[PDB]
Symmetry: D3
Subunit: 301 residues, 6 copies
């Protein structure tokens, strides 16, 4: 059975739209109603699934494959309307909350970053205020707009504001541009969020940044949220707000190794907009990030 | 001055964001919040402008010598809220009509046409309509999706912006009682083939007569081969030359507004969809001059 | 549930990899081992599924939707090796034969045209020598090659040779170029096949060609095999051997209306190679062709 | 011997950079210095060659193949500078003239349409004032100006002005979009609209009447077909001909006395699926066949 | 007011086709007549403008925005003929000189690199022989020849030869692939290899030492970065710099006395996801910021 | 003569389909019958040739002045039968070596390297190997898939074409006992990062020494950002400059053959994969000159 054969699921996982008893459920969130610039992330889950067949959940020299250590399934997608932002967020919250009643955690494949507010609400409900590892070119702590409460530049502001996040245990890495509009990092920093700009990441290195994550997060339940635009546009052209001067794929993949030293309770990989991609490299990278997160969940638990 | 030089305006027209005294104002509506399938029409005005430099408003055997046109830039449409975006479009388009005769709106998804109909009916009363589309776009609204792109002509008829007895829609195919029951004349792609351009033009003239008419073109009326850059393509469509030839009949009508919607440039190839959209717009501007 | 949401099946049909009791099973054949020029048809089923969500099986003014008249399902794909032509053909034959033990018919989404030999073998086994309506820019009655018994230019030669086809009840429409290599139509014509070149089709028109199909086929069980390259490259750029000067999409779709006047017992839509496509228009057309065939099956039965 | 194997030559013809004694030499002209809008036709020959391996010079029910009737070769390209329009046009004429000293005729693969003036100069030197069949969305009879003598909208104005063309034996077909000079000189202009009325057959009859048996040069701008069929071109014009219409119309060439031809304005950067270059190959293939039929 | 709305200007700056009294005018130069390989840079300004709406002139932790420190405007484009290299270069110089009569400086968005000779001519007229920071995979100090005086490999040879540049204050960085003239004139060449050894910091130190406080022109060929980061360019050269390296290196400009700059060779037809044009915008944005910082 | 002019040969070299007396012959292997995922490498030689005109064999601070090279065209490889295609490649490559010193094979999928190894070992005995790849390609063959693209180095070791104690493979990542058990040195992408270019080059020199060495480059060794046009991309790969810098060490070795495989142009963007492949080939040719 060649890897491109059969209806595409994430990493060729079994499909079950009403999953019960799994460790990690992969759930798509095909929605881009929060996008402020280029849309198209509504196709992110479809494209990521299509390209994911390539990727095995077996590493190099890591012993047993992820899927022999933990039980995972592709639960299909949340039925998110493209016509109403507030309804989509509520729907996502309800669906994600549902998944946690009989499954340990989910990996949400987006979809624009606004959806993370729904995920944080679901996860925080089960675990209390959460530590956060956030990889992004943008802080995403901007204020809501008239008529846009949940644009894709707001999710971590809502997370802090609603106490879904313990900002003293939040680290965001890769920051180098403004999303929707210029807004200082004063809100984040004043709340105690540790911001690691792309510049600082260059100084710290993968190792130093990983140490910083372990120190800030400790063993608190942690949600790891990855905006694909964290990496340079060369590595992830298929995204709605590219920001030149970003991380290399290998830096992001190496950094995520530290997740297995934490207590991850949820994760997401957002903002893949496949129409802007080239050779599917963005969706392939998104898959690999997802795979690494799953493996690290296994290692951690 | 090569045609690609300078900041791109529609057909290299002058730009004036607050125009007054023009015959037709070209106005972009960069918004795709009504799209049900592929988004990207928010970039339609930019792409159309970018490709439009190629196109002269001089045919074979000059528009901008006959009438006064200008590119009024865009309506600032939020991508986050369909209700606010439609209201904003309505306000802006209505404002344009207070000071100028008519507009050509470059979309943007077809939902925006309700705003256009509202503005135009405010000036001319209930309107005749010539609607070119693969889809009827007379589907019901529902709570949470009041202005999806399949509703504009339903809203138009419901709100009495359209006189359905003077509305013809051409090109419908793929995958109608409401429309027909209201008196709308539907010309499927199949029927269009039987009637031909000339028979369809005769039908339009018969149905619309001299009534103030809004001509609304969904780029998806033509086969996906001619317009790949669109959100809901429908195979088995009209040839570009058929649509362009058909639109010559507009000069025999009394056009009071027009639009060219649903160009989604990310799906285009070689810019051909945006070039065709420009040519459609150009034809409409010329026919406005001929009519008036 | 927006049409791009959920794991993609053909026209959003239910999925069942072991279907029993359906009227028409949609089965993918992700294989391009028979391609002589550009490969990539192995991705045809995936791409066709992905773009098919757009298309409803409800026509305009046709009353009840296809799926309210007949029971259809997406059976997933045949696991076709990309490394061995003869094994792939045998595997396809066996799988397709299996489907007919508990289901009335299938719609095979290819995959290169070589696979049709397997389909003809399965269908002929159930119904005896078959009438054939073949839409293609190429006759596909070329001889096998050293090391290539089942290249994509051979299927109708094998069908005639093995008596899977009643050539006196076979019509091929759209012929205008040579595939793999130049070969006269003498073999086909000498066997009594009616060849309607693209030129002749222009003279006959859709209506005249449909009359010709009804006359030649009658009420014999008929297999309808569509090579996407029948239409001009403008309408189907995503294919392995384009041939300029082809039919319009609407001509092909109109012609296929005559299928409901026949006794169809199987069909396929082959040679979509999505890497060469633009805006997905080829896969969208392939979907619509499939939809029309399904509707016509319903009408006929 | 798969069609995509080997270094790409036009229709897998043999290559000879200094051909002598052939019937028709296929010569590339990789230059876009005359382009007024999108450039990229400099890559036309390369892309056409690459996609051409698909296409056999054997038709359906047409008998022996073209290459069994006439001896053809791919002569490579003319070394045309991208930096100087006047030098490129001069170089083109010299090279084309050279080919005609040793071979009966050439099929030039462009490259932008300005190059056709060089071809006309070379061909008229051998045959005298020429009849012309010109397929294009644009008339290409616009005036030259200082600094742009050879923009791509000039070749037929030069041809007429220099008496390389007998305008009373020139027909241009497909004109549309956005003509006194041409008409006043006796050129028959068939707009796309008029072509729709006349049909392929009526237009072919018209061509035969206008050209007669005068030596004729057939020049095809790929932009004559609708952008749907030829997206890869520099100045697309919506509302154009179908591929099948152009190919069928070109059958009339075998009833004429063709002495040269070209296929211009393919700009592969704007193409999709290589369909423009595949069509250009098929047009060239039809022209070669009709050359064999005529002679 | 979404970033993709309105007619596209560079970074959504106001437009004024006859700007007077500004600090820095952004001027497009839509011309690729100097290109030796792939054309298409004529569309550079249009594509850069279209993608630039994304990018704010506000940095991270950098304080007040660029446009709050300096007054900038998009001056539209120079009307450059695609048909004549010499006329285009002359036109460019005239237009750029005009801008300098009424505005402090300009940022030119190309267009192929040959245009830089016109910019250098205009800028040196105001400031005398210039220091130069040149980022490129290629030295662009190749000789001119008759018929191609201004191909895109010549601008810095002209600049040195005409004494528009003080070569003892010129540094070129990124050179690689496939130099006596430049070195013999005192130019400091930093190959991509040497850049790897020196690092961003070492190279910046070198620039500061070489340029000092002499008026300096900063010219960036987008092909300095690896093709992975800038695929949309005419002569890509594998093995190039990372985007982040170029952006970080350009921080040193605020320690200098910049009097002009440009960002050349974007050819959008070869771009993917618009990433080249987005990067070009960010480079321009950094140059404007460093101009404000310097002054 | 502009670099895009003339029929495309590798780096504008002369063409001779039956060469004799050359130092290195460039030979295309247009075949993708071993691909397990995306096909299209059958077009690798054509695309590489098309883009290669850009690249001069003159570095900074001239190859074709040092050694004599030629483009020998392609091997006529059937797309329909893997066993016949491998045998054909072997025969053709062996024929080239009877009359010329070495070849640079431009692929084509990596399965073809078994044929190359067979031909080269016939001239030099069991070979040292430097293999750059995201994948080890030492997977087992099976009936019906004897020469899939994940087998070439397994066949090489099994058939004694390779001395595994003198084989190093660099770049392995993603998703090895056979190889390690045979003495192969595997340098994962992670280890490569620790060692750097210089440490890896030292390791290669130590392992291979002066033994006749075949250098086989899978384009997928570099990150998909640098080489999108390939059949099995693996994120987190090497930068182009790292691969090019590493290959400088070949000039300190005794190279007897090389290849650049798995370019699949349909997935490329801006031709960057084919341009990189050309530069890799160019570097290898220069290092051949330096070594010999
Ligand atoms: Mn972001
Ligand atoms: Mn984000
Ligand atoms: Mn529609
Ligand atoms: Mn519509
Ligand atoms: Mn076919
Ligand atoms: Mn076929
Ligand atoms: Mn033309
Ligand atoms: Mn022309
Ligand atoms: Mn350069
Ligand atoms: Mn340069
Ligand atoms: Mn590999
Ligand atoms: Mn490999």
């Amino acid at each position: 059975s060649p890897r491109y054969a059969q209806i595409p699921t994430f990493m060729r996982l079994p499909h079950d739209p009403q999953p019960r008893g799994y460790d990690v459920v992969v759930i798509g969130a095909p929605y881009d109603g929060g996008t402020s610039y280029r849309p198209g992330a509504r196709f992110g889950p479809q494209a990521i699934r299509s390209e994911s067949g390539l990727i095995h959940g077996v590493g190099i020299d890591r012993g047993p494959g992820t899927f022999d250590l933990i039980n995972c399934v592709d639960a299909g997608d949340i039925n998110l309307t493209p016509f109403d932002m507030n309804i989509a967020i509520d729907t996502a919250q309800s669906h994600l909350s549902g998944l946690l009643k009989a499954n340990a955690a989910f990996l949400m494949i987006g979809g624009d970053h606004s959806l993370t507010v729904a995920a944080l609400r679901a996860v925080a409900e089960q675990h209390g205020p959460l530590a956060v590892v956030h990889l992004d070119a943008h802080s995403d702590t901007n204020p809501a707009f008239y008529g846009g409460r949940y644009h894709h530049g707001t999710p971590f502001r809502h997370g802090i504001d609603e106490k879904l996040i313990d900002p003293a245990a939040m680290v965001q890495i890769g920051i180098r541009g403004h999303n929707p509009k210029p807004d200082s990092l004063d809100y984040a920093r004043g709340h105690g969020v540790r911001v690691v700009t792309a510049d600082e990441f260059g100084e710290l290195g993968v190792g130093g940044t990983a140490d910083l994550i372990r120190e800030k997060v400790g063993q608190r339940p942690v949600y790891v949220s990855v905006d694909i635009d964290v990496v340079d546009p060369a590595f992830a052209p298929g995204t709605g707000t590219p920001a030149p001067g970003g991380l290399l794929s290998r830096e992001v993949l190496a950094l995520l190794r530290c997740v297995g030293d934490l207590k991850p309770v949820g994760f997401d990989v957002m903002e893949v907009s496949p129409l802007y991609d080239h050779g599917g490299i963005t969706s392939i990278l998104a898959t690999e990030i997802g795979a690494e997160l799953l493996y690290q969940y296994a290692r951690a638990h």
